[PDB]
Amino acid sequence: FQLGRRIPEATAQEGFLVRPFTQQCQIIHTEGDHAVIGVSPGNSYFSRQRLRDLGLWGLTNFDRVDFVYTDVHVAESYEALGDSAIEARRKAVKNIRGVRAKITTTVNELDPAGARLCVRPMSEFQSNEAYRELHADLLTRLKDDEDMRAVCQDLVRRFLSTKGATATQEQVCMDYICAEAPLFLDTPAILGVPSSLNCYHQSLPLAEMLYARGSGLRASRNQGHAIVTPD
Question: Where along this sequence does the record place binding of substrate?
Fold first, then answer.
């Protein structure tokens, strides 16, 4: 249930349906500067074949493509689901090795020279100054603004109710989403590209806020989101 006025529909491209979240995201998709293909560890959707298909779709449609796999708050999520701390870390380490390796093989196969397609962990952005400024700003607004925070908690509970939940599961999920958020706000600032489309096979839980009309916390005018699913 999207809140904008001319909701884009999906365009079929190299085996995917690409659905930009707003009309302005569709302009960014058409610019073809940059895509982030976010990848979650422990998620069987990201098979070797699906990653290859994504990487081919990406290089066909953008000048540059960055696969970014989430490697932060993974052990914490497994603990919040009931694993011991030791076993949560064991499984996080295993799932993070598997997704890193599948992506790395993909990228070596498609772009041996590392010219257009790159993979990196989400934690690598912790030393990026724009990422750090985006993250701190987001945390400060949540701390300072309880109405904005309440909207984000509702969006977290909606997202968890699909995948009820405890306070701990909510808090860890908020942490996990806050850590990805700078790439959903301003990948152009973090990666130095003209514009960027942040792509996933489900809409981002905070999309309704970050890509909305009005004012508040909003993604950069050069940042877009698309939902990208197999045709």
Answer: 43, 176-180, 200
Domain that holds residue 75: 1-231
User: According to the entry, how was the structure determined?
Assistant: X-ray
**What is the three-state SS of 164-207?**
CCCHHHHHHHHHHHHHHHHHHHHHHHHHCCCCEEEEECCCCCCH
State this model's resolution in angstroms: 2.0
Residues flagged as binding site for substrate: 43, 176-180, 200
Rounded to 10 degrees, the C-alpha dihedral 155/156/160/164 comes to -100
Residues classed as catalytic? 40
CA angle 80, 81, 85 (to 5 degrees): 60
Per the structure, the count of domains in the chain is: 1
Binding-site members are: 43, 176-180, 200
Looking at residue 155, which CATH number applies to its domain? 3.40.50.11710
Contact yes or no for 202/106 (Cβ under 8 A): no
Strands 196-200 and 34-39: parallel
